[PDB]
Amino acid sequence: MREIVHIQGGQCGNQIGAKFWEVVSDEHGIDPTGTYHGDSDLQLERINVYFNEATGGRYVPRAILMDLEPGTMDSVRSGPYGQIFRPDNFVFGQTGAGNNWAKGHYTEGAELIDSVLDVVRKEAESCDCLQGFQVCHSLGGGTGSGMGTLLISKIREEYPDRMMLTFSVVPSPKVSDTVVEPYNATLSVHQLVENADECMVLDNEALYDICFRTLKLTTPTFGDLNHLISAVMSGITCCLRFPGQLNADLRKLAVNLIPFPRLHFFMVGFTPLTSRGSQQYRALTVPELTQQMWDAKNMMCAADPRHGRYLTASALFRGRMSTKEVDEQMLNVQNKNSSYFVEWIPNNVKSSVCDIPPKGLKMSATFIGNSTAIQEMFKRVSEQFTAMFRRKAFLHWYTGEGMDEMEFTEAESNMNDLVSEYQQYQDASAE
Amino acid sequence: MREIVHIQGGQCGNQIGAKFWEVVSDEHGIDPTGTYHGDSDLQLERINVYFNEATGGRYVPRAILMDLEPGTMDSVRSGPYGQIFRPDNFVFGQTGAGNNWAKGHYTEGAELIDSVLDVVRKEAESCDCLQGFQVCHSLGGGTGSGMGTLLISKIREEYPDRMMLTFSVVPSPKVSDTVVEPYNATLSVHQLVENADECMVLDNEALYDICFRTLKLTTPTFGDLNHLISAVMSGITCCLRFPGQLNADLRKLAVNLIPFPRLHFFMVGFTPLTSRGSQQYRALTVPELTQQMWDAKNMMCAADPRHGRYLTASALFRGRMSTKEVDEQMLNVQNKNSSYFVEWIPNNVKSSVCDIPPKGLKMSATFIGNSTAIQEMFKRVSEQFTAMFRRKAFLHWYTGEGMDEMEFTEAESNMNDLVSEYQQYQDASAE
Amino acid sequence: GFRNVEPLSRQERAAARDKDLLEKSRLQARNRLKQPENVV
Amino acid sequence: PLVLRHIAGLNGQMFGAMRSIPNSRGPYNIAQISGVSVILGNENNLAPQFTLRGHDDVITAFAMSHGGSMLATGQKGSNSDVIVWDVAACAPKYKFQEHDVEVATVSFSADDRLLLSASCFTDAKLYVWDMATGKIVAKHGLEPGKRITCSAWSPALANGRAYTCATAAGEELALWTVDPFTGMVSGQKVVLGTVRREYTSLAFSADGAWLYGGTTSADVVTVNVQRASVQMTHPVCSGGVGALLLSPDGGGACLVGGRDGSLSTFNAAGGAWRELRPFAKVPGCVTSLSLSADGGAFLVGTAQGGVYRLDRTSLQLHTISQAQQGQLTAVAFAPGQPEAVATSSTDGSIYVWSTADYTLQCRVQEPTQAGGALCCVLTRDAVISGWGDGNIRCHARAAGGATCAQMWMIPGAHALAHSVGVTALRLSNGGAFLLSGGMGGELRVWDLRSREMAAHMKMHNSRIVGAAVMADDKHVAAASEDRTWSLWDVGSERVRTTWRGQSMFRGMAVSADKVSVVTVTLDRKIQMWDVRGPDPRWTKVEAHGKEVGCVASDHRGAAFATGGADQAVRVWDWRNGGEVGGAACHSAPVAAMAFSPDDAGLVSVALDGSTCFWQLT
Numbered sequence A, B: 001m002r003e004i005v006h007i008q009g010g011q012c013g014n015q016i017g018a019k020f021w022e023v024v025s026d027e028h029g030i031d032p033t034g035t036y037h038g039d040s041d042l043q044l045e046r047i048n049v050y051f052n053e054a055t056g057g058r059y060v061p062r063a064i065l066m067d068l069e070p071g072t073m074d075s076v077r078s079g080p081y082g083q084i085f086r087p088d089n090f091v092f093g094q095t096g097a098g099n100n101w102a103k104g105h106y107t108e109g110a111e112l113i114d115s116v117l118d119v120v121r122k123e124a125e126s127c128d129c130l131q132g133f134q135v136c137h138s139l140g141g142g143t144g145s146g147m148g149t150l151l152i153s154k155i156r157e158e159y160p161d162r163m164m165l166t167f168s169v170v171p172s173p174k175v176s177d178t179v180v181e182p183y184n185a186t187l188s189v190h191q192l193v194e195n196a197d198e199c200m201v202l203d204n205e206a207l208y209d210i211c212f213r214t215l216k217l218t219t220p221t222f223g224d225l226n227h228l229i230s231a232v233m234s235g236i237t238c239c240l241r242f243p244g245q246l247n248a249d250l251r252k253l254a255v256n257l258i259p260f261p262r263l264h265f266f267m268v269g270f271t272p273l274t275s276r277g278s279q280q281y282r283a284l285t286v287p288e289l290t291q292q293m294w295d296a297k298n299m300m301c302a303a304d305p306r307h308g309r310y311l312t313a314s315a316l317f318r319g320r321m322s323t324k325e326v327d328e329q330m331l332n333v334q335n336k337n338s339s340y341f342v343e344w345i346p347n348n349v350k351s352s353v354c355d356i357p358p359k360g361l362k363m364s365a366t367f368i369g370n371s372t373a374i375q376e377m378f379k380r381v382s383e384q385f386t387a388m389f390r391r392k393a394f395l396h397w398y399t400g401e402g403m404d405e406m407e408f409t410e411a412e413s414n415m416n417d418l419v420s421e422y423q424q425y426q427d428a429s430a431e
Numbered sequence C: 001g002f003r004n005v006e007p008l009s010r011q012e013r014a015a016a017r018d019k020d021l022l023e024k025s026r027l028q029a030r031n032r033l034k035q036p037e038n039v040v
Numbered sequence D: 001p002l003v004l005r006h007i008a009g010l011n012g013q014m015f016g017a018m019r020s021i022p023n024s025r026g027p028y029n030i031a032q033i034s035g036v037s038v039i040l041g042n043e044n045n046l047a048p049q050f051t052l053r054g055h056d057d058v059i060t061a062f063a064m065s066h067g068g069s070m071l072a073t074g075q076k077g078s079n080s081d082v083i084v085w086d087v088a089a090c091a092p093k094y095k096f097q098e099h100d101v102e103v104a105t106v107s108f109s110a111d112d113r114l115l116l117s118a119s120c121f122t123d124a125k126l127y128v129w130d131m132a133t134g135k136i137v138a139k140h141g142l143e144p145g146k147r148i149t150c151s152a153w154s155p156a157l158a159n160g161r162a163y164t165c166a167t168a169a170g171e172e173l174a175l176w177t178v179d180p181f182t183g184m185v186s187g188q189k190v191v192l193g194t195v196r197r198e199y200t201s202l203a204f205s206a207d208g209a210w211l212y213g214g215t216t217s218a219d220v221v222t223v224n225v226q227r228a229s230v231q232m233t234h235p236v237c238s239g240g241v242g243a244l245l246l247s248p249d250g251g252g253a254c255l256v257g258g259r260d261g262s263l264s265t266f267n268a269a270g271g272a273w274r275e276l277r278p279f280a281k282v283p284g285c286v287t288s289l290s291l292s293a294d295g296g297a298f299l300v301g302t303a304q305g306g307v308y309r310l311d312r313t314s315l316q317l318h319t320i321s322q323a324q325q326g327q328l329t330a331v332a333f334a335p336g337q338p339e340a341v342a343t344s345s346t347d348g349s350i351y352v353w354s355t356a357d358y359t360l361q362c363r364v365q366e367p368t369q370a371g372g373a374l375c376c377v378l379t380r381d382a383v384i385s386g387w388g389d390g391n392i393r394c395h396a397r398a399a400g401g402a403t404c405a406q407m408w409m410i411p412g413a414h415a416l417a418h419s420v421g422v423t424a425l426r427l428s429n430g431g432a433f434l435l436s437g438g439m440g441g442e443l444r445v446w447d448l449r450s451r452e453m454a455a456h457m458k459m460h461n462s463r464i465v466g467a468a469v470m471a472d473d474k475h476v477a478a479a480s481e482d483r484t485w486s487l488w489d490v491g492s493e494r495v496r497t498t499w500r501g502q503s504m505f506r507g508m509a510v511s512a513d514k515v516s517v518v519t520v521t522l523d524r525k526i527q528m529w530d531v532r533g534p535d536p537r538w539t540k541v542e543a544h545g546k547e548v549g550c551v552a553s554d555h556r557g558a559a560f561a562t563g564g565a566d567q568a569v570r571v572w573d574w575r576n577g578g579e580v581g582g583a584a585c586h587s588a589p590v591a592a593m594a595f596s597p598d599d600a601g602l603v604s605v606a607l608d609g610s611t612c613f614w615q616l617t
């Protein structure tokens, strides 16, 4: 009865949202038609968090799809679960943003943002009680980042108290897809710091590394990365949708994770990720899940936690498990790796337990870590942004859309200040 | 609950280990798919010594396969029991050691040894209590001897108190497979003397002789020799896995066998080995088993014990048997062959009884003899090594992989010192 | 008019997969007294 | 002597588990997959059925030959064999042991001359076999790990040099042109174009060049075979597709099933607008669609284990049979009523059946988080079942087919942080209390009037399977995994006994006389025991080829049945042993069973879901 309004932005955001809705519908026993075929009461017990009931048994996701080019949402509609979404929630332009954050935030996003907020308000007002909004999108893409930041600002203005969760695909460290990735990322992080209450950083190269090393897949397409992202997106909110031995909502996670308001960026990971060869040969135990969870390779962010210090870390476990086992495992991890954990917080673990594991898995566990390791991710993005901005390469594309040059400096200053805060709490000493 | 970590090295070691795991899985009633179809409580009572429980009823062997060429492991995996082993326990390189101890110990064994120790540590930390490690490999081969000695040294460094048991296939006296067998053997024996707590010498020609004379097998495959070795390797530890009337673990055997730390080499044999023709004609009694056991042809080492003197001898009997009958047989053997037993030890026999015989056999008995007869085998290996090293034939390969020439001299000196100790205790007189 | 080729058995593939079984079968095929390495 | 009366089984997970035999004037109008074997039965129930059994593990693919042959495929065991069955012979015709892993799919040519068999793992091969002798083409390779979902053949383009086989593997469609004269296979991947859907079923048009693929998105994707590209997509039946059949006559029509039970008629022509309107709704999820009774019925299957007959002239719906889905764990008989049989399952479903006609008298359903119904006890107006969560739920027995109402529940009856799930429920003679056995070895006697606990009785340290109450305020357990069984007393005090064997038990029954107790061990040994004796009176060794899993007992004490993993149920005299009658009909290991209160009648259940009814005379 605590609703969540999902929004997808850009091509990457739309694909991630489509995969996520596919996974959630599979978990609730919802076929691409909206009808329930799950044969379990708990599946329909809290289905109203994500879905609304149609005239019949049809369940329409509370999802809103954004784009400036129609091809991405044509593909979304033609995908496996394209028919669950209400057609009125597909908001499309005609000319896509040319990987231009300025186009997606100022020129072309301005016209479509009115319709986007209208659809968002219509979806929110139908909700009994609203936990908040989750926005899935990519940093380093024009329409995605631009419209996502603009919409997040608008929703922050309209609903300050309601939670804002963001799944942002930060541009990858080593292999960059588009040239203007540093510009878009720098502009978008400035908005996410100020507006987004809770933000998750995802890197495609970290996803490739985890799917090639742990899953040991040979040809991982974007579908597999979207599947892992969808798994994390489901697991963070499964406590809302299912009974929990120690349940924890998004606001509880944010309260126990965010020490200071600006330091709300988190690296996330899902367990157990097992290769097909070793699926039988592994054993699903709480210690095994914790061991795989605290591995740096499990992180979906490029930054490895070993360099930084864990400010906080929430672990949402799913399945019939011992709370004593969970608490003992996480306390043992903290004691063993006390060097990697902040001293002035006696307990850096927020453990939650949910009664319903994901389909196919006896046990699971999603991890949300707030650590100063993300400082190096921001530092690298700034290291590229400064190099480009010194010679003002591609600057005219953003300048001609009507945003001042001083905005680049302001965004860079804000992002460097965030880096400074992360370093300060990395090397802060107790007393 | 006293676990043992099995390690296979080289082609010969991998084949022997595969046959050994097949034998143990059969004895515990484990099908090649890992499920328990054994139909006995005692089989599952102590299955944790060699196996771990998977997600379901599957049991994963606590085995680690190590090699530098993937062909042997591919064959083992395609074999009948290739699917029980955890795929993560197959550590292989890419270019095999060309029968070069230097390549298997310094150049190519260096890179793979990190992964091998990683797998070993992962297996060992999972063990509640660790009796130790058993490493099956062949002296006189590049990858086998190389990483066998290297890994044995590393595991000795990591776990000093934990038991080390080795099954080394020493190059055979008369027929030699590769040219550099004496070089590899000389380099490996020096390592085993320092590192291995308990070492078991096996010779392919001794195995051929025993299977051609006792078994009357005319054209014995390597699988047959591996299966005899597997029977010995099972019988040495069956007291850990099954209840016994007078049980004796690996440490008890080592304490009762090794008089002085450097004299830890043993010749072993299995009973009752019967030819198919005379199987109905042979009647199994403890005296018959002992008569076959103390026969020199029954020993799986080429050295015959008649030349040397038995320092110590342990015999692990298996089956519903009279302790009086066993003890009387062993005392009578000592009295009759007192000329072959060391005088300054009043009782040279460590008799152990387990109540569970192997599959198909009413009774069995595995023998482990520490006698000065091993002197002649090491003497022969030195006779070949010195002849080759005087003219420095094939020395340039070992030199170009980066060991000083002085390593050969030191290894030869150590082997000669071991021979001298064996002769000293052969001709030592009481008082 | 369909072309046909003889289907091989699972036992033949298992024998090809296993080093021991293939060699034992070859020894049995080698000669007629006691077969050399008769017992599989 | 055991006489098989009826087998109720259907592999509801498979798409196409049941299928008609076209133009079948003789017996055996339908063929169903239930497990290891195939149930070849007549369209009308209460008729003899045959059991095509030549496999060792579950069946992964079932194919009809459009009248003339059936085909089932194996799974694992290194013997994933493609076995061809003949309608008239009812015997295996060809046995292709060429797939190292389970055969993913199998299909027959429209002219019943070619046979397509596709594996997926470590050897992915599109074997095409001729009806005479063996194979035609080795393979085309595919790729390991690509789950070949379904396959179909083109009715057209049968010039002897071409045969268009459509194969749906995950979200991939491939058209395979096969030259059987030269034995070549060319595989063209269909250009999707943002069309990513999981295809449940495939079917070509009558004239070809139009392949209809039903998807889980309730859509039929029409693809141009000539261009090998997705042409269009239309929604057909909300819920999914399941089974897609060509219309019996049609203009361009195509009958579509749905997971909602809807059956509609989708035509490629008719514009982009459909406005779905089913002509028939069946209860459950449609997975099979065919035509039989001289093409007068539509013979629609269900994922819920149901087979239904839909008339074509008047759309009349008549059920044929129902199959309990999952691993069936216990069988119960009403204390005096032989007409009602209760069968439980690891799935949260219990079926009370009328043994006269094998119809579903009533159904008990519980959510999956409530464990599985691991034991059952029937009453004149109640169904008491012990589940995998340790709870004992009693439901109001209904009639005519309906979801039963849960009258009450003993909560946490057997759940002690080391073993959950009560097994081997028993009722007191005449009805006074309820004996229950936990997964850890605790026996518990419960009052029936007040549902209060009356005795907790904890000596056995492992699973209880085979508890039984004597004729007077006493009871006894079986205690698997600890190879002993003890007769107890309701005064919370063990009365001696505690007889230990040598192998772990699996079931225990008590004869009509209060002194005879039969136990069955994993050693495939049946042990007879006298309560007055310290040692078992005798033991029969190798009762079954594999482990025995369940034992029963007639209420007269004359005979007791024994079912094991050999899929064969045997009958043994209580005192003399021997085989009164034995037969193998379940397509799985036999998990539980129950004698009828009267002389005639034995009802057994299997691990696959097969319920076999037996006449003892």
Ligand SMILES: Nc1nc2c(ncn2[C@@H]2O[C@H](COP(=O)(O)OP(=O)(O)O)[C@@H](O)[C@H]2O)c(=O)[nH]1
Residues within 6 Å of the ligand: A009, A010, A011, A012, A013, A015, A016, A096, A097, A099, A138, A139, A140, A141, A142, A143, A144, A145, A169, A177, A178, A204, A222, A223, A225, A226
């Ligand atoms: N994980 C994932 N990442 C994607 C996907 N599609 C695109 N991306 C990444 O998202 C980044 C930005 O592209 P995007 O924002 O979608 O382009 P836009 O929609 O025009 O703004 C690119 O660098 C891509 O690597 C997808 O399906 N999954």
Ligand SMILES: Nc1nc2c(ncn2[C@@H]2O[C@H](COP(=O)(O)OP(=O)(O)O)[C@@H](O)[C@H]2O)c(=O)[nH]1
Residues within 6 Å of the ligand: B009, B010, B011, B012, B013, B015, B016, B096, B097, B099, B138, B139, B140, B141, B142, B143, B144, B145, B169, B176, B177, B178, B204, B222, B223, B225, B226
């Ligand atoms: N008993 C037995 N001996 C073997 C087997 N395979 C090889 N050998 C012997 O072991 C000796 C060493 O070979 P090996 O160490 O396996 O070669 P490597 O793996 O390249 O180092 C050779 O002389 C072979 O005669 C086997 O399966 N069984």
